[PDB]
Design an enzyme around this catalytic site. Sequence first.
Site, PDB file in Angstrom:
ATOM      1  CB  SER A  37      -1.462  14.108 -13.846  1.00 44.11           C
ATOM      2  OG  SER A  37      -1.822  13.811 -15.176  1.00 44.11           O
ATOM      3  CG  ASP A  58      -1.816   1.135   1.324  1.00 37.89           C
ATOM      4  OD1 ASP A  58      -1.945   1.883   0.327  1.00 37.89           O
ATOM      5  OD2 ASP A  58      -2.452   1.290   2.397  1.00 37.89           O
TER       6      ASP A  58
HETATM    7  C1  LIG Z   1      -8.949   5.430  -0.546  1.00 44.58           C
HETATM    8  C2  LIG Z   1      -8.415   4.426   0.433  1.00 44.58           C
HETATM    9  O1  LIG Z   1      -8.843   4.458   1.619  1.00 44.58           O
HETATM   10  N1  LIG Z   1      -7.468   3.493   0.126  1.00 44.58           N
HETATM   11  C3  LIG Z   1      -6.955   2.540   1.033  1.00 44.58           C
HETATM   12  C4  LIG Z   1      -7.794   1.756   1.821  1.00 44.58           C
HETATM   13  C5  LIG Z   1      -7.283   0.817   2.725  1.00 44.58           C
HETATM   14  C6  LIG Z   1      -5.887   0.702   2.799  1.00 44.58           C
HETATM   15  N2  LIG Z   1      -5.052   1.451   2.051  1.00 44.58           N
HETATM   16  C7  LIG Z   1      -5.572   2.349   1.186  1.00 44.58           C
HETATM   17  N3  LIG Z   1      -4.639   3.088   0.433  1.00 44.58           N
END
Ligand SMILES: CC(=O)Nc1cccnc1N
Length: 330
Positions: free
Chosen positions: A199, A35
Site C-alpha cells: 500500500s 481464505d
Molecule cells: C491471522 C490469521 O491467523 N488468520 C487466519 C486464521 C485462520 C484461518 N485463516 C486465516 N487467514
Amino acid sequence: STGSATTTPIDSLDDAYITPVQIGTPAQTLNLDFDTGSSDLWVFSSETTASEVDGQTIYTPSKSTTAKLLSGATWSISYGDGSSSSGDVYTDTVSVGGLTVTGQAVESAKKVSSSFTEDSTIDGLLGLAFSTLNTVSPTQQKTFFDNAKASLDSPVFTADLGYHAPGTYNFGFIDTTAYTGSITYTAVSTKQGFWEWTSTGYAVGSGTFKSTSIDGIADTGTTLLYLPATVVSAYWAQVSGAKSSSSVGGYVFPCSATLPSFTFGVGSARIVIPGDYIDFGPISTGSSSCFGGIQSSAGIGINIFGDVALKAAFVVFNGATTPTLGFASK
Ligand SMILES: CC(=O)Nc1cccnc1N
C-alpha cells in the site's frame, strides 16, 4: 468456465464469511471459509474426533462415489491466530458456484482446535493463497483455484465481501457491474506464498494522506485490519477515550464513540473504510467498551489487510503468470 457463489457473514459482526461448496457425488454441501491467507481445502468429516464436532456439517467420503483416499498423504496446519487442524486426504469432485474441479485434494480433519469446534457455522476452509503453502505431505497439493485456473475464461477470482450483508466470490471473470470507477492494479510478491502487496499510504478520517509504503497481505480469512503500530496509534488517537488494553488484547474504545474512516492507498487510488466498519462491538456482552477493527501487527510479523479492509473494496486476485491484485471502490 466461470463460477459465482454468494458469501455470507457468519454473525452480526462479520467475524468471517461462509460460502457453500459442493463436495462429492452425490453432492455434499459444506459451508467453507474462503481464505486467501492459506492454501489448504480442509473439512470437518466423518473422521473428525467426535468430541471436536459441535454442529458443523461433515463430509463423509464413504458416501461419495467419486472420493478416493490419497494414500499416505497427511496434512497439518497452524494459523496465525494459534488455531490448527490436521488429518488425511481424499481426492474428490469439488464445485463452487457452478465451477467444477475433479480430483481436488479434500483434506479430511481428524483433529481441530477449540476455536474451530466452537464455531458451528464454519464447516472447513478453502485456501486461495499460493499452492506453495499447501501442507499436504509427502506430495504437496494444489488449491481449488490453481486446479481450476486453466479452464477459467480468465485466470482470476474476485472477492466482493459485504458489510453486514452477503457478497460474492467469482471465478474466471470480472463483473464490471460490481464496482464503481476503475480497478487499480498493484504488484504482488509470491515469495512468502501470500497475496502480498505494498500500500502507498493512509489517511485517518478527513486528515491528510500520509505517503508511506506498507507491505502486507490481502487475507480474506482474517477478520480485522492489522497495521504497523505507528499507523494504528495515529488512528485511535482520533477517538476520545480509545486505548490499547493488554488485558483485552488490543485497542478498545467507548461504545458511545462515532469512529472516523480510514483510507488506504493502492497506487494513486484510495479505498475508504467507513468508520462503522471498524466497530466490532462490546468486548463482552453488555460492556460499554468496544473492540476496534484496526489493530497493531506488531508481534505478528506481517501486516494483514483482512476483511475490515477488503470489504470496502471490490478485489481482483489476478493469477496470471505474473500475479497482481486489483482494488476498486464499490
Ligand atoms: C491471522 C490469521 O491467523 N488468520 C487466519 C486464521 C485462520 C484461518 N485463516 C486465516 N487467514
